[PDB]
Write a protein that binds this DNA or RNA. Sequence first.
DNA 1: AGGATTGTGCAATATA
DNA 2: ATATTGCGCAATCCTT
Lengths: 66, 69
Amino acid sequence: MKHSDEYKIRRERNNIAVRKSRDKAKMRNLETQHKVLELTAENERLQKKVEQLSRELSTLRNLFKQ
Amino acid sequence: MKHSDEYKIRRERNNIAVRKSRDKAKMRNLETQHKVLELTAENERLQKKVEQLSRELSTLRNLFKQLPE
DNA sequence: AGGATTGTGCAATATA
DNA sequence: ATATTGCGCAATCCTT
């Protein structure tokens, strides 16, 4: 129907639940996007650390010549 | 009005656009989830390499430390 | 008995 | 003009 009070209450409650469900789905989607940004920055940091450790190892091993 | 031909054409075109837009958004979310798996595998590879090189550097520094002046 | 999910479409808004 | 976004609805699924 469209007039009964049981119907109006059911719609009011469902509209709350539908919005809650859609907000939750949107939040999960955004969280996945953020995770990509976080991992990309972290992999960039770790790669720079690899390069730094390699430079320190090379510098140390050069001491064997002198 | 809401029964005119112009209204019907606008809504039919928009409904097509809505499905196209939401399909693409769902596909992007699928690609993003795949990217997380790929970046996680790369992260684990990098963590292993950093740990290996850190140990290699620590042992070599300790070797030089045991050298007499 | 009542919330959570979802295919669908109206509507407002953003964008080109 | 199309693209994006929020929402209502009703059917449906799941909880209590």
